[PDB]
Amino acid sequence: SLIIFGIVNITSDSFSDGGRYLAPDAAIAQARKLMAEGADVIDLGPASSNPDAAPVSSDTEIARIAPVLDALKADGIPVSLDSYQPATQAYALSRGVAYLNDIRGFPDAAFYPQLAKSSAKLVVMHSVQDGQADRREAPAGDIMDHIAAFFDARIAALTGAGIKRNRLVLDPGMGFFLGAAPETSLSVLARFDELRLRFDLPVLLSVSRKSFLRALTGRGPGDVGAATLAAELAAAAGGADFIRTHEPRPLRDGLAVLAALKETARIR
Amino acid sequence: MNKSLIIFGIVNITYLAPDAAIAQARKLMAEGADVIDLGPASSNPDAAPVSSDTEIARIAPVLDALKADGIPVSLDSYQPATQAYALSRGVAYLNDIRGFPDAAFYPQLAKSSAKLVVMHSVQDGQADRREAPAGDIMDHIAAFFDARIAALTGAGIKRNRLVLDPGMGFFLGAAPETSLSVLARFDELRLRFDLPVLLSVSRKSFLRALTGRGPGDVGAATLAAELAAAAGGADFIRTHEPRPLRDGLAVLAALKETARI
Ligand SMILES: Nc1nc2c(c(=O)[nH]1)N=C(CNc1ccc(C(=O)O)cc1)CN2
Ligand SMILES: Nc1nc2c(c(=O)[nH]1)N=C(CNc1ccc(C(=O)O)cc1)CN2
Ligand SMILES: Nc1ccc(C(=O)O)cc1
Ligand SMILES: [Cl-]
Ligand SMILES: [Mg+2]
């Protein structure tokens, strides 16, 4: 099927909604709203990773997420922790989160023993930065080759340390995580099924509100809802297993139309 | 045909004063419409009927302005007196939810250059909540167009003036599945008649059955259905909101470009 991650940024400067859900009550309120609007999982991010973002200590990330995890765990709301800091990831594992979402793709082998002892699923993201986004360009050649080579090595490293293959979800990266050229993001949005087929693992895409959509439409920062929906539905039609989005309700409505079209056309 | 997607922007007088109807028309063109579909009345399931005189009075000053602006106009009316008035003002299209069933009007249609949006409905008129006939809805639509294209071209209306609209929503009956079949299968009409197809899904009630939000905003479901229709080959889309559609089409065009270019 398709699992929707609803983005809740507990940050002062996330690129499209910084500050909004900084207070734990604001983040909790948004998380519950997003679940009612169609999210299946709340992707909780205590620090921005956009190009102009500023990092914070793991102590601060934990202080930002701790009351929110308390509430969502009591609420029975599944949580993915969007953090690249191993100390924050370790805290989340001790609270029993459903997923870890690492924009660095779990590159720290010293943390692998702790990853292996947990049941949490792991969203392993590829980036050309191997970290916080920036505006460099992607390597020359076929971007899908570069992404597959990354996942080949990182999956072998993770599974070699006792993280079971079926815990893994693959995110090829999107937007500035793929470099400054919108063509690179469009290639990955068009061709991520090559990753699903090669690795026989689910794929997660996060196109929501990313800058390459503004470049295609000629539009300003708060004007990218329609382009986002079109890109998300194209990802769904391409077979995406997870979509991480700021606005699950338009996505849910669009998926309802596409699913009903599919069922209606079936000859069985 | 090769022509790229043409968007009809909906301006329904029902209340728009003419200055407001003119303003919304210009707005829709700025947002991505190619043609303004101007409707003086309402053909919802529940909207009251006005006289042909009232329809003409409502559109006359709006046509004045849109004509002066060089804005192509499709007149959405099923009343032949209103259609005759619009033809005499040289509109680009007539859009008839009855599909031009009145053969007494065919000589006047034959003498105009205007293109004709010929819509199918299970009512043969204003939308209601009856359900569809037994059998494949696509067969009933094809049979309707077989007969009506033959009738229109038989009266001297040249075939290439015709745009086919299979109907949508309550024009197809109360079941959402009937609209979904048509939205999924309308290309069958394109290839059977070698004529372009127009679809109008915008804000129709079957999309509400899928949002679960009843009377609430249905722009997202509308966009999804419109993009599916564009991807499925629709030649025209009639919509309330061209701008999100143009944005979505820009994403698909940029994606398409990667598949080959
Ligand atoms: N799994 C996963 N997690 C994320 C992602 C993402 O793409 N996938 N993006 C995030 C947002 N950071 C940005 C990066 C690039 C851009 C941009 O290109 O506009 C915006 C935001 C953060 N967390
Ligand atoms: N060519 C063309 N013209 C129209 C159409 C339409 O579907 N095609 N729909 C119209 C609106 N009438 C409605 C019918 C049904 C529904 C509904 O199902 O909700 C809503 C509105 C009027 N004008
Ligand atoms: N509720 C609706 C009212 C009008 C129309 C339309 O003119 O297409 C569609 C839906
Ligand atoms: Cl099938
Ligand atoms: Mg974030």
Numbering used by the authors:
A (entry chain A): 4 to 271
B (entry chain B): 1 to 14, 24 to 270
Reproduce passages from the article.
The sulfonamides (sulfas) are the oldest class of antibacterial drugs and inhibit the bacterial dihydropteroate synthase (DHPS, encoded by folP), through chemical mimicry of its co-substrate p-aminobenzoic acid (pABA). Resistance to sulfa drugs is mediated either by mutations in folP or acquisition of sul genes, which code for sulfa-insensitive, divergent DHPS enzymes. DHPS catalyzes the condensation of para-aminobenzoic acid (pABA) and 6-hydroxymethyl-7,8-dihydropterin pyrophosphate (DHPP), producing 7,8-dihydropteroic acid (7,8-DHP); this compound is further transformed, ultimately leading to tetrahydrofolate, an essential precursor for DNA and RNA synthesis. All three Sul enzymes adopted the (ɑ/β)8 TIM barrel fold also shared by DHPS.
The Sul2·7,8-DHP·Mg2+·PPi complex structure provided essential insights into the molecular architecture of the Sul enzyme’s fully ligand-occupied active state, containing both products of the enzymatic reaction and with loops 1, 2 and 3 engaged in ligand interactions. In comparison to the Sul1 structure, the pABA molecule formed fewer interactions with the Sul2 enzyme and occupied the more solvent-exposed positively charged region of the active site pocket. In this conformation, the pABA carboxylate forms interactions with Ser214, the p-amino group with Ser52, and with aliphatic region of Lys213 and the sidechain of Phe179. All the protein-ligand interactions observed in the Sul2·7,8-DHP·Mg2+·PPi complex were consistent with those observed in the Sul3·DHP+·pABA·Mg2+·PPi complex, including the hydrophobic interaction between pABA and Phe177. The pterin group and the pABA group of the ligands bound to Sul2/Sul3 or DHPS occupied the same spatial locations in all analyzed structures. Leveraging our structure of the Sul2·7,8-DHP·Mg2+·PPi complex, we modeled 12 clinically relevant sulfonamides in the Sul2 active site through superposition with the pABA region of 7,8-DHP. This analysis showed that all 12 compounds would pose a steric clash with the Phe residue of ɑ6 helix, including the most primitive sulfa sulfanilamide, whose structure is the closest mimic to pABA. The modeling suggested that the sulfonamide nitrogen would be positioned 2.1 Å distance from the Phe residue, resulting in an unfavorable clash. The modeling further suggested that the N-acyl substituents off the sulfonamide nitrogen that define the different compounds would exacerbate the clash with F179, at least using their energy-minimized conformations in our models.
